């Protein structure tokens, strides 16, 4: 039933604004925390309970924390439109940033703030009766997102134990870039993240820019568009908890179905009817068409091509007016294709979910209104290329010790670079070896 | 005379692939 | 042509530029490209430092200093002997000889 | 996150006066000190440059220092001069005499304690202190000597903050003083040890900006100081207004400096165009980026085309799409790839801020770390070697007390700085 | 018949969204173009 | 049931405008894509489905793609009268033309554009349940039509396999000409077309100009007239799929009846009641008269005389008010003629088709209104003369390598000229060998 | 598909002024730069020649270069001069002196970097760049030297695009300057290597056009430059308007040039007729076809009757039937077989465009590749050999620095061009 959201740094807070806008508008909570219940349904309703708690006077308050080291974005949230929705203790802000240094976030500054975060999360978790996981939003390219996200996930993993942790992660894009030191922070993040996360979903801004140019008709997209797409994806995945349906899917089902070996937990994500109103009105949008859509690499929100690898597992979420026979016919058609390949040790490649609630339309939004949608998360060996290019860029800089004095001054041993780079080399070899056919190994 | 020559310059801007096409359906 | 070329017709070897293909054949480059960076235009624009159409080795051409002249209409340039002396158009042109690799 | 500014000598005091005019305009502060602005966005970060005194008024956290009071009477006579706190003006009774040793050792040590006392009083009043910002010339006397003295003392007292300097250095072509090479060499020796990040400006480059780009008929030192005040106030804009991708002085330093000696940077500001021409070309992100990398728009005599970029940073102000910024900066990196150091895979950082400078819808400021800066230092060292070999004026400095070994140390340190830049400037195919 | 009527209503809603999106696109394009006024040139050519 | 139309370059798009105008007017779809609401027929017909698909709101959209390298013609379609009919994805346009170079289309530019075209065609083929062939319209005289048409037909032939591909092809006229380099492009196109097309129909503008001058009373014809004639031909051939009739003819029947050996697949086409309104009232138009008409060489749409060869197979399509007994009597009278000769290995020379739907009348059109029409496609050895003349033109220029440096610069080996010219020489010898009587060889 | 224009020297700047008048008239652009047209067909391709400046205005994508500013003040003073961007005017201080070596080596290298900077500024702004168009005279000083210098630099930087030149060459009969043969010979040597397609015009042919066909009582250089601007604006018409059979500069080059050195073309424009005669003859395709091949209407002194056509192209503007175009070109090809090179089976390309120039029902422009162009170069070589054998004025060029071997290079290259044309003229099938 309940889930707690943790938003870290700039990308995570900005994506949080779009997420909470959507969850408010879909459930019907006013920006000041109220529910104008006007229906004659006779008995009350509970779908909000996953994301909101009531005090008793009927105000709603949400199950989230916003964590940042710089004040500006959280103070912008404090002064914005949703001022009265959040509890002021939930919005935590430090004085100064981690300056794109993972070492500064992890060792120097995040170590002071981290205990307040755990006290707030504990205070939330005590006001629950069926918590079934954490959703975490952060970017691994920046200093506080990497350092404090890793430190906080380590502490959470010790304190809460078996509870599942599902990450939505913005990785450094393969040729658009915003800062020089992105490879060092991403390598060190991935080193910490390997041990302490159950499924990690990867996003690249370059892919969502391509998708918004190609599918939507937007010449000049900005982060609010990308954040609204991410919010739609998270709403699709969590809808199985919140509304009636034929085949529900609990958050624990993802980890069991998607991860074959404990290091192989990085998944690709795509969403089908990303479409403009003029295209939406030029075409019918049947189940088989959107099922065909989720497998094209042009639909993905991460810049990787799955045609350079083999699929290991697929998880397909359908929401809206869909019938199981059409899902079966679609999946059988996908299975027929010759350019779609599964590893020979994974014969039963699919997990299905079917929910009746269609996706909500946001007043200022750019997506069309549609009767049905499908969302996919999938595990594929093609992902090894993302690590290989990050590792190549790391090798290029570290071969000349390009920036190391900053990291050593802010508290990190030089040895940590070699350890992390060797761990990522072993991860590359794992993805190379797992993809080797069984007939060759006798 | 002047108005006729003034009107004779407006009709020089026309395309030829849809010349006279209307699209009405015979019953 | 069925004949073998004569000595006069074999002088054409000097006038042409020759290169190897990828499979080992010997050919002639019809239209050589600049040995510095240049443009190949397609559905997208791209800069190539080196391309197979180049004849000589790739190199970065030298350029003249942008701030050589005085900030004004007066005819004063920087000297060619050192970095601080000045010169004018008296008996020589100092603006044409300010090209340097670095 | 509060900045403390220091302005030293005549050039520094004049640039400071123009800077505080620009900053007071952006936050809507009347020359009486009363707030008269028209949006709350102005108030919420006013603390960054102003302290609040009681009953409305605001006073600017700046120390004014000079060895002869002529400039202070000129700044007090200026249009914004009244805003400054009376106790913050520190001055002596006799000039520097254009001599570095005079400015540093004899009259320097007499005043320096009162300047440090004022700077400490100002620093300890902040709730959280950001780096210092210092404006001075290197060719002068009190500017060079007392500026570098104060920099050394503040770096001893506040080693964890940022130290940032903007510095003007004498042209080989348009000099006002004969003994410029000694003062420049000793000051560069002090800066390369003491500074965290240093920006260098040639008056010749600002004249070429004014004459070629702005087509000014009768330029004055006020215009030159406006160009400098524009870039200085632009660098801090993301500190004090909201934006889609915030940035900070420390974040700039972390992305710009690969190794601690290579901390000297070039500056530019893009939307420059004469009042007659402006009707013929609209401002746009491709146009700003193209002007931004054009050497015509760079504030030093050395040209980027003779070196290679290790790193660069662009700070954008205005309401604009992130896609155009990202794709333009990618296109510039791809198109000029030979001028970028190849063992760093992507050299440019971008940042975006919502609030532009007054009277422009959008603007960008450019900071560049390029090896062509070595040509400037080599030229100064050449003029020094011509003068030093012949003992041309040394008795003044020796009579103040300097050891010649100081001169040989400073020459050796600058020569090693030039060598370090020179190895990275040229390619090595092997 | 009921299902067909529902589909028609959704199509009409899509038409309305198309019109709104066109208006918003025009407004954003107007917003993103640059302009200069007199505060730009205030500090130049004073001869003081 | 379904057929997909592919329009390439300038001639193919302009002929497409006339074709889709005709198919709309024949079925009754309005330009905005909605059936008229004033009619109260009560029945809910589906015959359009061969060419249109419905979304569900009742808009119609057509099963076509328009492919071009220059924008201007497709932007004219986008801004024309049928703007709202087409889905915008179907209208694909590049930046710059193939400049009359086959090499530029095939190697440099079409190789870049072809994957978008293949993705659109795939998206069409996924929305079918009884696809029974591709119809392709292009000219082999221009650069993009030859190079990209060949490359795309080759890719289609690998990807779709056994599915039939029928081409409508504009060959270079024997004295009307538009560009100097036409023989090189037509030879190099034809080399690819031998392997990768099932039936190819050839058209020459000089024949349709002669036909419009002689039969119609048009002193100054232009391309819109020719394109309306071509549209009528395509409507006649595809009418067998769409309306009731005595003897239907599926698109697969053409290849079985017309092609004796796998290289001998180029057929001549003609159409009978091309007549003006003033002539139409002086003459009756019975079955036997139009059957006699289709055999006169003045009726042909390719400048060749079939009296210089021998027929191998004929396919006669009758549409309108015709009775089988009159078709049989007419064909037996034709068979009696002395200037019509069949190869002795082909005794049963004829295939017949009979459809009840009469030809549609277009408001601006130049053909008269007639109750019946017949259209013929036939295979004959006379066709060898067209290739022989394109060869001499190729040989005269290639003797001096007159233009080859353009082709070699745009990516082609000089060897490809000699290969194609030798293959066409072998095709000439094939037409000599196939036509030799068996009685002479004992 | 954007064109960049370069205007060089007095002749080039004047022809350019008339060209931009003609283009602004055809698209209905006011001399203030405001769009005032009356059909969307005018607006939808305005980008091809104009860039859009802010609030309404359009600016023309052209660079003006000259060695003495006398001309620039005259073009700025002209009726459309205001439209041009002030920063686009590039000028020197001292004149070319009618000397090729001076124009190429001393003042050329001084200015050339600023012209390349402007050309790059214009080229990199296009979303997709089509060829360059250059107007200059070959007999002058700055026109010849700086035009060929700039052509060489642009050919280095954009080798995959099209390079187009319009060029004026000295009459054998009415010269304005004595040293014309040297400048012409050196410039043709540069062009035959660098250019993709080159059009040549004799002022004598324009005078004969004006006097015999137009019967003008008092022609001026404005009329000659109007005829040239008419053809220049006509060649690009199919790039920028719809039509039944589109055509393009690259398609023209592919159909016109059999071998890469044979890229010199003849020009004509058909609907020319005096105001007294105009009442007597309506426009029709036969009339245009008869005038287009009439040697009275061709813009070079060499006449087709002494040579043979390798290839030709005709671009028709107006609403007309394709049948008449095809049948006219067939009838001329069949009836005139001796004037066409026999080892090419069809020499004429046709093209048809829907949109005529305003106020004319129909127009055609004719481009012809004919071997009789060899007679002009031989004639220029004769005048050169007369001057060169006696070293008549050589000390000026040698004082600039040329080796006499350059003159022998230029003679050998022109002689080889004449020989190659003569050999292809007399080739046979065998
Ligand atoms: N999609 C998306 N990406 C964002 C957003 N905000 C920042 N990014 C990207 O994430 C990376 C920057 O990470 P930041 O979140 O700014 O880093 P940080 O967490 O603030 O770390 P510090 O700079 O030390 O404070 C860049 O690649 C940005 O493009 C956002 O709102 N949406
Ligand atoms: N019947 C008919 N023939 C046409 C039509 N359009 C062009 N042609 C002929 O086809 C040949 C020209 O081929 P194009 O279609 O223009 O060549 P393209 O496909 O555009 O190739 P590119 O020029 O490289 O873009 C000439 O013989 C024209 O006469 C048309 O609409 N109808
Ligand atoms: N840009 C600028 N340069 C100045 C200004 N005042 C002086 N200078 C330059 O600085 C040098 C003189 O240094 P100065 O400031 O007098 O040194 P000080 O005596 O120690 O303060 C000369 O090159 C002057 O041209 C000013 O207001 N602006
Ligand atoms: N057709 C034409 N010829 C011109 C024009 N102006 C000058 N000329 C001719 O060009 C030659 C002079 O060259 P010029 O342009 O002055 O050379 P420059 O000094 O290098 O610019 C002479 O033959 C002039 O007759 C003009 O406007 N039109
Ligand atoms: Mg941050
Ligand atoms: Mg074409």
mmCIF file of N, CA and C in Angstrom, chain C residues 59-102:
data_model
loop_
_atom_site.group_PDB
_atom_site.id
_atom_site.type_symbol
_atom_site.label_atom_id
_atom_site.label_comp_id
_atom_site.label_asym_id
_atom_site.label_seq_id
_atom_site.Cartn_x
_atom_site.Cartn_y
_atom_site.Cartn_z
ATOM 1 N N UNK C 59 47.815 18.956 -41.004
ATOM 2 C CA UNK C 59 48.512 19.954 -40.210
ATOM 3 C C UNK C 59 47.571 21.117 -39.938
ATOM 4 N N UNK C 60 47.892 21.880 -38.897
ATOM 5 C CA UNK C 60 47.084 23.027 -38.513
ATOM 6 C C UNK C 60 47.755 24.293 -39.016
ATOM 7 N N UNK C 61 47.161 25.016 -39.962
ATOM 8 C CA UNK C 61 47.829 26.194 -40.523
ATOM 9 C C UNK C 61 47.985 27.309 -39.502
ATOM 10 N N UNK C 62 49.061 28.074 -39.665
ATOM 11 C CA UNK C 62 49.315 29.220 -38.808
ATOM 12 C C UNK C 62 48.340 30.349 -39.126
ATOM 13 N N UNK C 63 48.168 31.246 -38.157
ATOM 14 C CA UNK C 63 47.223 32.346 -38.287
ATOM 15 C C UNK C 63 47.888 33.628 -37.806
ATOM 16 N N UNK C 64 47.388 34.758 -38.299
ATOM 17 C CA UNK C 64 47.879 36.064 -37.891
ATOM 18 C C UNK C 64 47.208 36.503 -36.596
ATOM 19 N N UNK C 65 47.943 37.266 -35.794
ATOM 20 C CA UNK C 65 47.395 37.779 -34.547
ATOM 21 C C UNK C 65 46.282 38.779 -34.830
ATOM 22 N N UNK C 66 45.205 38.688 -34.050
ATOM 23 C CA UNK C 66 44.060 39.570 -34.254
ATOM 24 C C UNK C 66 44.319 40.980 -33.747
ATOM 25 N N UNK C 67 45.110 41.122 -32.687
ATOM 26 C CA UNK C 67 45.370 42.410 -32.048
ATOM 27 C C UNK C 67 46.710 42.995 -32.475
ATOM 28 N N UNK C 68 47.093 42.801 -33.736
ATOM 29 C CA UNK C 68 48.395 43.271 -34.198
ATOM 30 C C UNK C 68 48.441 44.789 -34.312
ATOM 31 N N UNK C 69 47.381 45.397 -34.829
ATOM 32 C CA UNK C 69 47.376 46.826 -35.093
ATOM 33 C C UNK C 69 47.081 47.612 -33.817
ATOM 34 N N UNK C 70 47.349 48.914 -33.877
ATOM 35 C CA UNK C 70 46.995 49.808 -32.790
ATOM 36 C C UNK C 70 45.477 49.943 -32.687
ATOM 37 N N UNK C 71 44.952 50.129 -31.480
ATOM 38 C CA UNK C 71 43.518 50.419 -31.335
ATOM 39 C C UNK C 71 43.131 51.802 -31.827
ATOM 40 N N UNK C 72 43.271 52.054 -33.124
ATOM 41 C CA UNK C 72 42.937 53.345 -33.670
ATOM 42 C C UNK C 72 43.221 53.439 -35.151
ATOM 43 N N UNK C 73 42.875 54.579 -35.753
ATOM 44 C CA UNK C 73 43.105 54.751 -37.193
ATOM 45 C C UNK C 73 44.559 54.991 -37.567
ATOM 46 N N UNK C 74 45.456 55.165 -36.601
ATOM 47 C CA UNK C 74 46.859 55.438 -36.902
ATOM 48 C C UNK C 74 47.528 54.168 -37.411
ATOM 49 N N UNK C 75 48.492 54.269 -38.333
ATOM 50 C CA UNK C 75 49.173 53.077 -38.888
ATOM 51 C C UNK C 75 50.384 52.597 -38.087
ATOM 52 N N UNK C 76 50.113 51.898 -36.987
ATOM 53 C CA UNK C 76 51.150 51.344 -36.128
ATOM 54 C C UNK C 76 50.887 49.857 -35.950
ATOM 55 N N UNK C 77 51.908 49.040 -36.191
ATOM 56 C CA UNK C 77 51.842 47.601 -36.010
ATOM 57 C C UNK C 77 52.915 47.159 -35.027
ATOM 58 N N UNK C 78 52.854 45.889 -34.644
ATOM 59 C CA UNK C 78 53.883 45.317 -33.791
ATOM 60 C C UNK C 78 55.063 44.848 -34.634
ATOM 61 N N UNK C 79 56.255 44.951 -34.057
ATOM 62 C CA UNK C 79 57.470 44.661 -34.803
ATOM 63 C C UNK C 79 57.647 43.162 -35.001
ATOM 64 N N UNK C 80 58.380 42.811 -36.054
ATOM 65 C CA UNK C 80 58.671 41.422 -36.373
ATOM 66 C C UNK C 80 59.909 40.892 -35.665
ATOM 67 N N UNK C 81 60.675 41.755 -34.998
ATOM 68 C CA UNK C 81 61.905 41.333 -34.343
ATOM 69 C C UNK C 81 61.678 40.891 -32.903
ATOM 70 N N UNK C 82 60.783 41.560 -32.181
ATOM 71 C CA UNK C 82 60.513 41.227 -30.791
ATOM 72 C C UNK C 82 59.022 41.396 -30.534
ATOM 73 N N UNK C 83 58.629 41.229 -29.273
ATOM 74 C CA UNK C 83 57.222 41.266 -28.902
ATOM 75 C C UNK C 83 56.741 42.636 -28.437
ATOM 76 N N UNK C 84 57.621 43.625 -28.318
ATOM 77 C CA UNK C 84 57.232 44.907 -27.750
ATOM 78 C C UNK C 84 57.482 46.105 -28.652
ATOM 79 N N UNK C 85 58.448 46.036 -29.560
ATOM 80 C CA UNK C 85 58.712 47.168 -30.434
ATOM 81 C C UNK C 85 57.583 47.338 -31.446
ATOM 82 N N UNK C 86 57.495 48.540 -32.006
ATOM 83 C CA UNK C 86 56.455 48.874 -32.965
ATOM 84 C C UNK C 86 57.101 49.243 -34.295
ATOM 85 N N UNK C 87 56.278 49.267 -35.341
ATOM 86 C CA UNK C 87 56.749 49.579 -36.681
ATOM 87 C C UNK C 87 55.600 50.167 -37.482
ATOM 88 N N UNK C 88 55.936 50.739 -38.635
ATOM 89 C CA UNK C 88 54.946 51.332 -39.525
ATOM 90 C C UNK C 88 55.263 50.907 -40.954
ATOM 91 N N UNK C 89 54.596 51.548 -41.910
ATOM 92 C CA UNK C 89 54.720 51.211 -43.322
ATOM 93 C C UNK C 89 55.912 51.879 -43.997
ATOM 94 N N UNK C 90 56.869 52.397 -43.231
ATOM 95 C CA UNK C 90 58.033 53.055 -43.811
ATOM 96 C C UNK C 90 59.010 52.012 -44.344
ATOM 97 N N UNK C 91 59.132 51.943 -45.672
ATOM 98 C CA UNK C 91 60.058 51.110 -46.446
ATOM 99 C C UNK C 91 59.770 49.615 -46.347
ATOM 100 N N UNK C 92 58.796 49.191 -45.543
ATOM 101 C CA UNK C 92 58.418 47.786 -45.474
ATOM 102 C C UNK C 92 57.011 47.684 -44.902
ATOM 103 N N UNK C 93 56.380 46.533 -45.137
ATOM 104 C CA UNK C 93 55.034 46.288 -44.645
ATOM 105 C C UNK C 93 55.100 45.337 -43.461
ATOM 106 N N UNK C 94 54.811 45.791 -42.238
ATOM 107 C CA UNK C 94 54.868 44.887 -41.083
ATOM 108 C C UNK C 94 53.619 44.046 -40.887
ATOM 109 N N UNK C 95 52.509 44.378 -41.550
ATOM 110 C CA UNK C 95 51.280 43.627 -41.360
ATOM 111 C C UNK C 95 51.228 42.292 -42.070
ATOM 112 N N UNK C 96 52.048 42.101 -43.106
ATOM 113 C CA UNK C 96 52.012 40.857 -43.870
ATOM 114 C C UNK C 96 52.890 39.761 -43.278
ATOM 115 N N UNK C 97 53.822 40.102 -42.388
ATOM 116 C CA UNK C 97 54.784 39.143 -41.864
ATOM 117 C C UNK C 97 54.589 38.867 -40.378
ATOM 118 N N UNK C 98 53.344 38.871 -39.900
ATOM 119 C CA UNK C 98 53.040 38.593 -38.502
ATOM 120 C C UNK C 98 52.435 37.206 -38.306
ATOM 121 N N UNK C 99 52.578 36.327 -39.290
ATOM 122 C CA UNK C 99 52.036 34.975 -39.213
ATOM 123 C C UNK C 99 53.015 34.086 -38.460
ATOM 124 N N UNK C 100 52.484 33.280 -37.542
ATOM 125 C CA UNK C 100 53.306 32.393 -36.736
ATOM 126 C C UNK C 100 52.466 31.205 -36.291
ATOM 127 N N UNK C 101 53.130 30.058 -36.131
ATOM 128 C CA UNK C 101 52.431 28.849 -35.705
ATOM 129 C C UNK C 101 51.892 28.991 -34.286
ATOM 130 N N UNK C 102 52.674 29.587 -33.394
ATOM 131 C CA UNK C 102 52.254 29.760 -32.009
ATOM 132 C C UNK C 102 52.320 31.227 -31.595
#
